[PDB]
Design a protein around this nucleic acid. Structure first.
Length: 82
DNA sequence: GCTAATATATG
DNA sequence: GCATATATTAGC
């Protein structure tokens, strides 16, 4: 898992114009508060619980998807929420 | 480790 | 005003 994962998520949130809640759900099937804590702590991927490392690689796996597919998934989750 | 709930912040 | 959003933490 890249040490850059944390800025790649923040850049992706800025770029997509998306909530922590929507990204957290589609990217790694977790809640808004967990992503908020994950982004604040920026814990060294090598120094991370397997639980947390699975989340980061779930996020990295999601972020390596085509921008077009990510943006479509974000829209489904919005209309599925709204 | 994480969730849902709650206290603040934004436009 | 307000909903929507995030930072925070009590509780499972």
């Amino acid at each position: 898992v890249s040490s850059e994962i944390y800025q790649w998520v923040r850049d992706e949130l800025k770029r997509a114009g998306i909530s922590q809640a929507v990204f957290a759900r589609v990217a790694f099937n977790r809640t808004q508060g967990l992503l908020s804590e994950i982004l604040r702590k920026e814990e060294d991927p090598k120094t991370a619980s397997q639980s947390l490392l699975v989340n980061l690689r779930a996020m990295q796996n999601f972020l390596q998807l085509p921008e077009a597919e990510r943006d479509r998934i974000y829209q489904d989750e919005r209309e599925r929420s709204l």
